Amino acid sequence: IDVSRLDLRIGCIITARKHPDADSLYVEEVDVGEIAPRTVVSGLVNHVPLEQMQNRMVILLCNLKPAKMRGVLSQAMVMCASSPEKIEILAPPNGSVPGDRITFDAFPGEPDKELNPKKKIWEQIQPDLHTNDECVATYKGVPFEVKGKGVCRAQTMSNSGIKL
């Protein structure tokens, strides 16, 4: 089981607001290159000011089974570097386009249509997901890259885990 099972894509947060029925969460509408934006619910209120959530490029895990979070069905998850004392949104390289896929020549494969909730194979992948010494996001040391644009990275969190 390697990273090829995950469907990682670039997205642009079109709109972001406090979740109407869960003030500790944000609800974002994200353009991920599909016909319609995906609704995403993120617990980033205590880590990123709302102003900095607007029109922001991010990396999303797109094949997790959608789940509700207070009457709000979350359809993807924003990839972040994290620790018990901080969370940082991973930044795609300049010029990334919604829908761009993060793939690895070292780990060839097509992502699952939907990660089976039962089994949770992402728990087996997460341990090898971390930013390196230079804050670049990696899977087993191989950088998250957008073909022809560059690598994805956290702002200050080095050697930090990336949760799924």
Curated annotation (Swiss-Prot):
Top-rank taxon, per record: Eukaryota
Limits of the tRNA-binding domain: 2-103
Entry-annotated residues carrying N6-succinyllysine: K120
UniProt protein name: Endothelial monocyte-activating polypeptide 2
Residue span relative to the full protein: 150 to 312 of 312
